[PDB]
Amino acid sequence: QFLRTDDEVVLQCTATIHKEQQKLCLAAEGFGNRLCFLESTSVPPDLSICTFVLEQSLSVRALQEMLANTVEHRTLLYGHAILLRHSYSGMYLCCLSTSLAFDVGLQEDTTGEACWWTIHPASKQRSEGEKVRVGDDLILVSMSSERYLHLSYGNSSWHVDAAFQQTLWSVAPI
């Protein structure tokens, strides 16, 4: 099966510390604090706030042409920029300006690069233009900041940010 625009998906990462491995899913609440956070699975405790829709998939050239022009169920392909709408809130996953790693959260406005993420394979091949398959692990890079959607450990919990190092995400329909 291939990932496609309009698919409802969850984004999961694998977190290991002190030899305890677990799978975590990206989540956000509809209101209040806009920042995303991560839930442990095993099914997360609250699946309705982890669901995103792949709303658009455009080539980087197309997207940058679109945006430049404002200044005065398609298969996802590697290298394309995607827009991910959080189902529960209707807002979009976004690299924020606030804090070496930036915060990742939700916003309403998609006219700008902060809500766009380019998809890249996990391997040493760029595989540019190849179809993304369910089962592939992906690297997601912010079009605004060029940082990676990234798993971080704090003092006691796992967090998600946009950082200078990569994380592999599993994106599957659910």
Curated annotation (Swiss-Prot):
Cellular localization per UniProt: Sarcoplasmic reticulum membrane
Highest taxon above the source species: Eukaryota
Domain MIR, first and last residues per copy: 73-122, 129-174
Expression (tissue specificity): Highly expressed in heart, lung, cerebellum and brain. Detected at lower levels in adrenal gland, stomach, thymus, esophagus and ovary.
Post-translational modification: Channel activity is modulated by phosphorylation. Phosphorylation is increased in failing heart, leading to calcium leaks and increased cytoplasmic Ca(2+) levels.
UniProt note: phenotype after gene disruption: Embryonically lethal. Embryos die at about 10 dpc, due to defects in heart tube development. Cardiac myotubes display enlarged rough endoplasmic reticulum and cytoplasmic vesicles that contain high levels of Ca(2+).
Disulfide bond sites: none
Role this protein plays: Cytosolic calcium-activated calcium channel that mediates the release of Ca(2+) from the sarcoplasmic reticulum into the cytosol and thereby plays a key role in triggering cardiac muscle contraction. Aberrant channel activation can lead to cardiac arrhythmia. In cardiac myocytes, calcium release is triggered by increased Ca(2+) cytosolic levels due to activation of the L-type calcium channel CACNA1C. The calcium channel activity is modulated by formation of heterotetramers with RYR3. Required for cellular calcium ion homeostasis. Required for embryonic heart development.
Complex and partners: Homotetramer. Can also form heterotetramers with RYR1 and RYR3. Interacts with CALM and S100A1; these interactions regulate channel activity. Identified in a complex composed of RYR2, FKBP1B, PKA catalytic subunit, PRKAR2A, AKAP6, and the protein phosphatases PP2A and PP1. Interacts directly with FKBP1B, PKA, PP1 and PP2A. Interacts with FKBP1A and FKBP1B; these interactions may stabilize the channel in its closed state and prevent Ca(2+) leaks. Interacts with SELENON. Identified in a complex, composed of FSD2, CMYA5 and RYR2.
Entry text on domains: The calcium release channel activity resides in the C-terminal region while the remaining part of the protein resides in the cytoplasm.
Family note: Belongs to the ryanodine receptor (TC 1.A.3.1) family. RYR2 subfamily.
The protein's name in its UniProt record: Ryanodine receptor 2
Full protein stretch here: 12 to 217 of 4966
